[PDB]
From a paper:
We determined the structures of both complexes using single-particle cryo-electron microscopy (cryo-EM) analysis to 4.1 Å and 3.5 Å, respectively. Both structures are highly similar to S. typhimurium FliPQR9 (root-mean-square deviation (RMSD) = 1.6 Å over all chains) and S. flexneri SctRST (V. mimicus FliPQR and SctRST RMSD = 1.9 Å and P. savastanoi FliPQR and SctRST RMSD = 2.3 Å). We have observed four FliQ subunits in the S. typhimurium and V. mimicus FliPQR and the S. flexneri SctRST structures; however, as we have previously observed FliQ to be sensitive to dissociation by detergent in the purification process, it was possible that the fifth FliQ is a genuine component of the complex but was lost in the purification of less stable homologues.
Type-three secretion system (T3SS) are multi-megadalton protein complexes that are capable of bridging from the bacterial cytoplasm to the extracellular space.
Numbering used by the authors:
A (entry chain G), B (entry chain H), C (entry chain I): 1 to 89
D (entry chain J): 1 to 39, 49 to 89
E (entry chain C), G (entry chain D): 104 to 299
F (entry chain B): 105 to 299
H (entry chain A): 109 to 299
I (entry chain E): 113 to 299
J (entry chain F): 8 to 264
Write the structure that this text describes.
Amino acid sequence: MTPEIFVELFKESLWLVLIMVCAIIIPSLLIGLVVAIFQAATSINEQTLSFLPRLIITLLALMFFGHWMTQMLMDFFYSMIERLPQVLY
Amino acid sequence: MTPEIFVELFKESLWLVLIMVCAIIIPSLLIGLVVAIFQAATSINEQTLSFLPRLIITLLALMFFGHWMTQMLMDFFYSMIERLPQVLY
Amino acid sequence: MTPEIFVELFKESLWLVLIMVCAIIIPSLLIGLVVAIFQAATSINEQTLSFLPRLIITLLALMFFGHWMTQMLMDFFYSMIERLPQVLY
Amino acid sequence: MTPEIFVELFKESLWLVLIMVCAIIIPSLLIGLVVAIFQLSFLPRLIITLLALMFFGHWMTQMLMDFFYSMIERLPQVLY
Amino acid sequence: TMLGFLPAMVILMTSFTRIVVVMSILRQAMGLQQTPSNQVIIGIALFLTFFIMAPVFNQINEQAVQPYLNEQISARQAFDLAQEPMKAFMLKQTRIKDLETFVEMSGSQVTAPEQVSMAVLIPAFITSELKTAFQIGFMLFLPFLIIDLVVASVLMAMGMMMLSPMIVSLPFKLMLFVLVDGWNLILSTLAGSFAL
Amino acid sequence: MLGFLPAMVILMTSFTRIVVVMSILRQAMGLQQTPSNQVIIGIALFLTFFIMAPVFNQINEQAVQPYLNEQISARQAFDLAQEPMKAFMLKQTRIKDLETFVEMSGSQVTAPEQVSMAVLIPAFITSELKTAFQIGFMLFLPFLIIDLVVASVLMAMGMMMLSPMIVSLPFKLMLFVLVDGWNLILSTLAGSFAL
Amino acid sequence: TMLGFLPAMVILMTSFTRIVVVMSILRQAMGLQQTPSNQVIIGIALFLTFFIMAPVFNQINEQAVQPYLNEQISARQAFDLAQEPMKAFMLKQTRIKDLETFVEMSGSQVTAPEQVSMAVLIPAFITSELKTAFQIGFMLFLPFLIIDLVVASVLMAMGMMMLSPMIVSLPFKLMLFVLVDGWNLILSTLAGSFAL
Amino acid sequence: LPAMVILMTSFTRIVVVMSILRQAMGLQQTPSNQVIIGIALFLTFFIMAPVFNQINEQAVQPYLNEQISARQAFDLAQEPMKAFMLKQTRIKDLETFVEMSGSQVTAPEQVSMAVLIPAFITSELKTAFQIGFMLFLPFLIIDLVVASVLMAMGMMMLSPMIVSLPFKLMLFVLVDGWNLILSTLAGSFAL
Amino acid sequence: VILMTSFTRIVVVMSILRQAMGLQQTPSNQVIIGIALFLTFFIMAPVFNQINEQAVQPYLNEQISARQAFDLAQEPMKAFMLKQTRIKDLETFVEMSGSQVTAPEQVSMAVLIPAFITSELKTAFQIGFMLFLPFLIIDLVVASVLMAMGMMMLSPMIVSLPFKLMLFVLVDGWNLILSTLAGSFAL
Amino acid sequence: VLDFIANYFWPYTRIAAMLMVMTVTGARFVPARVRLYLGLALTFAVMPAIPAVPSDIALLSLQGFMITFEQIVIGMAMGMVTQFLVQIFVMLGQILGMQSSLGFASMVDPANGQNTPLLGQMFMLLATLFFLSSDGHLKMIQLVVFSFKSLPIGSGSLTTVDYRELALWLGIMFKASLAVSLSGIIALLTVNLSFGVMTRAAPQLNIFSLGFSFALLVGLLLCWYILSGLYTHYEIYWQETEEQICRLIRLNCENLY
């Protein structure tokens, strides 16, 4: 019911978002990096070569982090529902 | 209804997406890569050279893998409904 | 209505795409190839040199093959309508 | 209404695109050719493109306005 | 309560929802934000239906409505007579394969299909329509997609990676659709798909 | 009260589940309101009369037949109609939602058949919509599989533009008709009930 | 029960559709996505249709509304009075091949296209208006597509690959639009298409 | 015109929370505004049951056995509905509307119903737009996550307001959603 | 009636600007309609003054009949619009309605309005071209700087939008264009 | 009998017209019956603080329609400012999104294309909460109350100089959205230049090699950072949008809330 408690409540959600997006992307980031390095090593200049492995790694990570992410977000939604009465008053 | 039956039901579709995509694309990646190897062996620096050869295979495979793909996805959609009553309750 | 009439009818559209695309594009590949060979023999490291003659070719082909292409695609649409009633029932 | 009146009407638009783009790019083409014969080559390649723009702009817009007007003219015969 | 849902049922008992879905799949197929009006779609479909169901409306008005001018009966004839012609109509379009499920799950298994309850045929008629509508769609859709694939490919061939191949490819689709007489063939096939 | 009775009485049925499911499907196909609201609220309205046939017949025999012959009405007939509705809905709600609402209402129950309608319904709707979303997600995924593969083959060739939501419509329609679509779907939506 | 459908008939009865369709194709042609321009399209086409049907609307007024002072009549030769001039008008803008592929579907053959059933001309009138409109659209579209191709091509040629040739083509699309005096010709051409 | 009475209740809050939810996950014109009006008209009968009981078993039936002035029934029923609101309205809203009324700042449980109504509805709207937006926020986490993951591999075009709707529904049902959302709205009323 | 006003031109200029920024639908078309509706009163105010003076007060002072007052009300509106329409464009439509007139003042309402709207759209585009000019210039110059660097991880539109903003507000932005939409209607 | 509605129509119209636009009530999520019965109830409450409407002005007469419009104008005007308020943050959101490359479909294609109002849709929640946490709507209603005593019924309306100042607000919105987001914008741009350096190192790295990864990350991170002290700027701009409404209904500011 305070302005600061709302902004705190939202920075929480943004932190959740950011950690999720890093968890998912950083594998894609590293795999794109290494495939680009392999490109520049032999001067193989191709644009969408690096779309197969990056997509593959993103799918594999979605398989991998499938449970931790949903558990995190569900915990967050639970905490949200816990905070409602104090928001009423 | 469980946080586990919906994670596994998820992993199924993710695995389908993975296998479909790789089956379609690996020929395209391979032909593009050999085109780039030929470019390097010929000092050729072209950007959209490896498009047509890559779309040729990306299409030929989609006709060669047509029935297998539509059968696999169809069978999946079928299994998405046999378990429908078990999950509704 | 059968899984094979819709996959073979689909092969037909994909075949159309393939033949139209290769008709329009192969000359562009030829001009791009010879331009890159020209650069390499002349030790010319230019990127968008090729685009002008290559665009010339693909815009010439759109007028060389125009009537044939719009005839092919029209006939295809016609065969689609013709075979529709044998698929509806 | 006939396929051929639509195919030719399209071929002419393509001819326009071709003759228009070349008038613009050929100077960049030639300057790039010479500078590469010497060999950076983009900022000059932009200068000369702007120069060709300011040079041939009146003729380009005139040609396109002519094409628009002719398009308008051959319309009622195609409608019916 | 039977005031705001009548427009959604009096149309659906008819062979109306097919042309709607067909023309609405086309309306997106053109690579083109709607541009007939939604009202245009509904109106061309409304008139196509008043045109197709003429054997049935000519029987509704003739056997039930005009007999209900002298009225000849206290509102009982039309409630019971208007049902058989529509049932005989839909039953020619309802697949038997789709009806088999809708009867065995209703329980009242009748040998004579025309003796099925109206509330069992209608839901069998709808699930049979949308299947036909989607078939006709996937038939009519493919050419407009061949154009788009070939256009996007030829564009990518020069490196024109950003040209948004949905502006440049609209003239080609509209050209093709004009060449083939378009609607004349289309709105005859839908008129011809209602084998009655 | 007339401004709500249409929405009040339609909710006692399984209308909402069919509505939400067909809506999720309509958006799964990516179709921008192609079967308009007057299409979906019509089809899901018909499937109600198809499903609620037993309940409706018992209503007519035990309420409308007594109302046309005027045995007793508007006091006893309304109550007699209240019964089979509870019989139907009560067989479809989960236990957990019902105990939740009955502990919330403060009035304690010993026989689940003996919840008042005003506490029965609000537990039915929550146990219906939850099933509706479960079904919807369970029907959705196969379509999503179609989108993400299409939306990846394009980028594999370089075609950043050309929204898959235009090139992946034919695949989805072919799939949907090959699996017979509205046959299997509308049967499970009709077989899910205990009625 | 017709509070939703009726609003769609009035625009189909008149030739409101063609202007909307062509100008909405043109709106996408400019690459200009505006719900504001989308809304004002209705206003433009609406007042154009006012100006166009001023002869027919004024004649219908003189035949019905001015007599509707004493009104002399009720709904028998008053409705069928107004039914006539609209049928005369639409008939001059439809094709004949379109109308004959429809009357054959109706089966109600008439020796006189003037004595044609209203419920088959309008379904033939719309397939004709849409075809004429798509023709006009493919006519008007080409110069803008040429602008787009030239723009993307020079951008790609100079090397600016990643730049989107859709945010920069719009100023030149407006230049070419105004240099041709814009709507003044276009609407004129549209008014030329409805040659009575 | 009578629909103010139902809107004097805890009706406008549930309507708003459900409307924020329907729009939280992609869905537009999914279950029609008529449907959510229905769900709210039911949750209100479930919540306000003690109030309607105070009304019925204390003023309604004795009015069918009238032995009283008809307006006395409203007078004795004007009080419990009042007492219900006074447990919900904020203090700031009440004092500010006492100011705005021009009447002197008098003790609570004493101000007329006419000042109570809008002070009640504005407090309800405040509570509702907060509850919903804190239930909204999670369903937006998923949207941002999936849109970012898309943009990661790219594809630039797959409208993330549908490719996320499966995740939204799965995650809304994994918490059972309604047995938490429709319950807390019933537990958010001490009366 | 809102079309008889200038709002038609105003909102089109608004949306032209919106898309120029590269920030699509960011000013919330509801808000755009609001601001454009408010300008219309800042533009039409002198006109509405005369509209009130001519018959409104006299009609309320019972100095003119109903239909006569209504006919008088359109006059200053016609005069105002006649200074915005173009000669050729008004000519096309007055001919296309057939019934020619000697004085443009004597042209009918329902036939001046259409020629008015197209004449307004044309000049609106004439304005909007000027509006796109600086923004397109900025996009081009930033893209060219990037290409001289040639880094390609730039996507000059997304890196150019901040420059579009820091160079719209830095030049006082809306105040200048507003002044043009005020000076554009030299009544 | 008791045709009272004729006595208080104008104040109700001003109230509800202010309401149909105000960022909380006149938004969506609230069916029109709610807002209508809210406005109609407010009048009964402020019935004391409303001067007698000028009699002799029948509603079913031109004289009445002129003033009724002359109040709808004021009502729309009061709310549209608050709309500008929340749209400041909406623009903050859409700038920081389209800079993160999150919203990208409409930046490459301003046409129909595809829009992603996600971050903007979130920041609108903030601005609709800040306007609610600090009870904006109460102050906004009190201003309408005072309006019946500063811009009374039948005595004038906004003047021409008022509209012009009001239509300047679009410039104010762009100025505010930059004053708030400058820190994050500059940082994101510097990081994009770091990208450009690392890519000039080798021309292999393209939009489909490491496309937008660091862009998405830093765009979200600096957005979370801006979130930290965001209430302060909202407080400042609330003062401007409050004095501005004070300018319309003159009201002699610096006297009360």
